């Protein structure tokens, strides 16, 4: 589970530098990021994604979704 504020904090504090970052998706959705020397498990799906596109996808969770 990963939300925008946690991801932005990692960027702002300098833990995530540059334009890409390793992302774990679970059930298709952004679950965590992975930094160098952090461990990934064999059944985790890892992809190198563009930081700015991760930001946009995570910001979708911040918008109000009305339902009846």
């Amino acid at each position: 589970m990963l939300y925008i504020d946690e991801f932005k904090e990692a960027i702002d504090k300098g833990y995530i530098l540059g334009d890409t970052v390793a992302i774990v998706r679970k059930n298709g959705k952004i679950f965590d990021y992975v930094l160098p020397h952090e461990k990934v498990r064999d059944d985790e799906v890892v992809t190198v994604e563009r930081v700015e596109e991760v930001m946009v996808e995570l910001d979708k969770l911040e918008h109000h979704h009305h339902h009846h």
């Binding site: 589970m1 946690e6 990692a10 965590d32 930094l35």
Partner: protein, 68 residues
């Protein structure tokens, strides 16, 4: 959550002889990577992750926030 939270939960976990894996279990709320980042202060815990950790460590939330 304030920055002393990570210090409290790391020391409490070690005192209890618990692993990070034992705190995070299936990791749907918190990955072991994420817990490691919280314990060092690298990442600020969300409220929902903080209350999850408190339950796993066997203490109330108020205990780890010192009644604030």
């Amino acid at each position: 959550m304030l920055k002393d939270f990570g210090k409290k939960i790391k020391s409490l976990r070690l005192e209890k002889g618990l692993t990070k894996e034992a705190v995070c279990l299936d990791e749907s709320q918190l990955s072991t990577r994420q817990l490691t980042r919280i314990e060092s202060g690298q990442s600020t815990p969300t409220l929902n992750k903080a209350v999850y950790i408190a339950g796993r460590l066997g203490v109330t939330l108020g205990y780890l926030t010192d009644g604030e």
